[PDB]
Amino acid sequence: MDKVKPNPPHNLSVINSEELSSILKLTWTNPSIKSVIILKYNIQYRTKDASTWSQIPPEDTASTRSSFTVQDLKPFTEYVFRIRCMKEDGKGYWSDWSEEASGITYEDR
């Protein structure tokens, strides 16, 4: 009745590794697909107060991931992530965004 799209890489969480005020582990749940077919992901990051978005390029996230330990984040400040997935090639008629996930890099002191 509508379109064709490889379903959101949903359940996007920013779970922090206890003490690590430099790192958030961004975890998500791939469409449904199992132990084959390469999925390519656009994970864009930035600070809570930024106008436009930065990037985690589809390199790590160029073959079906479901998790990524994001490193080099400013302490105590909220860094926010936005992801969607396409199936192998460039033909990918995008799945409507997984969601926004917003993570605070604990405290420096």
| Residues 48, 82 contacting (CB under 8 angstroms) | no
Interacting residues of 11 by C-beta distance below 8 A, sequence separation 6+: 27, 28, 29, 98
Q: Which two tokens stand for residue 45?
A: 């990051």
| Residues 46, 80 contacting (CB under 8 angstroms) | yes
Query: In whole angstroms, what is the distance from residue 55 CA to residue 46 CA?
Result: 8
Q: Method of determination?
A: NMR
Q: Could you give the domains of the chain?
A: 1-109 (2.60.40.10)
